[PDB]
Amino acid sequence: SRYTTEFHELEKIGSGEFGSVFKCVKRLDGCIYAIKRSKKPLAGSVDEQNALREVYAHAVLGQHSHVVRYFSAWAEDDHMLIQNEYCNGGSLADAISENYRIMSYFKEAELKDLLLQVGRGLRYIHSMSLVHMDIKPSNIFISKVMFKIGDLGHVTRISSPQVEEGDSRFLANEVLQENYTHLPKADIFALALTVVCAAGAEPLPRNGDQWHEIRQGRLPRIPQVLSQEFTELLKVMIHPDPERRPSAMALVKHSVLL
Numbered sequence: 633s634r635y636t637t638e639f640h641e642l643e644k645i646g647s648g649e650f651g652s653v654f655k656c657v658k659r660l661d662g663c664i665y666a667i668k669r670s671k672k673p674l675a676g677s678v679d680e681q682n683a684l685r686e687v688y689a690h691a692v693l694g695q696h697s698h699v700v701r702y703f704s705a706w707a708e709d710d711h712m713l714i715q716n717e718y719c720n721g722g723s724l725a726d727a728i729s730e731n732y733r734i735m736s737y738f739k740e741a742e743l744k745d746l747l748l749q750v751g752r753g754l755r756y757i758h759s760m761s762l763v764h765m766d767i768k769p770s771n772i773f774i775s776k777v778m779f780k781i782g783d784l785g786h787v788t789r790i791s792s793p794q795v796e797e798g799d800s801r802f803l804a805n806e807v808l809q810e811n812y813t814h815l816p817k818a819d820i821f822a823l824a825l826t827v828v829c830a831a832g833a834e835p836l837p838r839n840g841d842q843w844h845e846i847r848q849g850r851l852p853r854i855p856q857v858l859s860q861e862f863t864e865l866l867k868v869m870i871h872p873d874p875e876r877r878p879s880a881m882a883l884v885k886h887s888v889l890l
């Protein structure tokens with residue numbers, strides 16, 4: 633086996649339904665990588681196509697500072713593996729839980745900077761005529777800290793007529809209602825919520841009354857003082873009218889981000 637023969641497995645850092653993720657050192661280049669090892673879905677089936685799109689997307693989103701680099705992907709003999717860049721600072725999710733336990737969140741300067749960087753990662757993706765569809769703190773990773781979008785498992789072409797939904801906590805309603813005219817804006821919606829989490833909000837709701845309020849374009853309580861301008865940027869990012877949310881390009885050129 634190539635995984636065993638080419639890498640030294642250091643530690644498990646991720647455990648899913650389908651997969652697992654390991655910190656490993658490539659024996660030949662001495663260098664450390666994150667490798668997701670997951671079940672090989674039956675050749676030529678809906679689930680296979682899902683896994684292949686991930687490999688396809690990683691393979692074209694490899695020039696970017698705000699997307700995790702892909703090094704390789706292979707299959708053996710009942711598993712599928714992808715070898716990506718390892719991010720020494722771990723995930724945005726874990727930084728936010730640590731933050732939450734200590735009552736010390738991302739400051740406004742840090743939140744702008746997270747939004748700008750991830751916004752740059754999205755701009756890129758959208759310019760590759762793709763969309764990510766599952767932006768959330770556990771799919772953002774950290775390496776001046778660099779934030780990098782990871783987990784392209786939901787990535788699809790911008791004008792897809794069929795879509796798998798990302799996490800409901802971060803899901804725009806128009807997508808829930810199978811309206812796929814402005815998918816790039818689904819990522820914009822999720823980015824804002826991600827940044828809301830970064831600011832120290834309570835865990836986001838999955839369903840029920842509070843799930844809908846936000847989808848009306850109402851921000852969750854943020855336990856700290858943010859400038860009105862920045863709060864406005866945030867609000868417009870979760871606007872019920874996806875056309876009213878700024879593209880990623882608008883996002884990174886926004887004055888509040890200069």
Ligand SMILES: Cn1c(C(=O)NCCO)c(Br)c2c3c(c(-c4ccccc4Cl)cc21)C(=O)NC3=O
Pocket residue numbers: 645646647653666667668700714715716717718719720721722723726773782783784
């Ligand atoms: C769960 N996880 C963690 C982690 O939580 N570490 C503990 C500290 O918080 C990292 Br870092 C990480 C990393 C990746 C993935 C991953 C996602 C989807 C598909 C394939 C992969 Cl390889 C999952 C990852 C990655 O690609 N690059 C990483 O650094």
Ligand SMILES: [Cl-]
Pocket residue numbers: 725768769770771
């Ligand atoms: Cl998350």
